[PDB]
Amino acid sequence: ERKYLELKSQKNLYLARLKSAIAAQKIEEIAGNLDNASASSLFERIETK
């Protein structure tokens, strides 16, 4: 009964970190920072079109 709440006290932190990490690359995809011109999306296809 002790160990269970021990783990429950960190489930949330892990979920938060994971969601932040996902969101990072999520908007890094759209409108790349163009630090390198290797690939940019949705702001170059539109520009080229």
Partner 1 sequence: LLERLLGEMELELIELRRALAQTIATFKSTERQRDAQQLIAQRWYEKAQ
CA dihedral 27, 14, 16, 19 (to 10 degrees): 20
Cβ neighbors of 34 (< 8 A, separation 6 or more) are: 40
> Residue 12 annotated as binding?
no
Q: Is the dihedral of CA 17, 18, 23, 25 positive or negative?
A: positive
Q: Contact letters (x/-) for partner 1, 13-42, by CB under 8 A?
A: ------------------------x-----
Nearer to partner 1, 15 or 41 (CB): 41
Instruction: Select from 25, 36, 38, 48 the one that contacts partner 1 (CB under 8 A).
Output: 48
Binding site for partner 1 (CB under 8 A): 37, 47-48
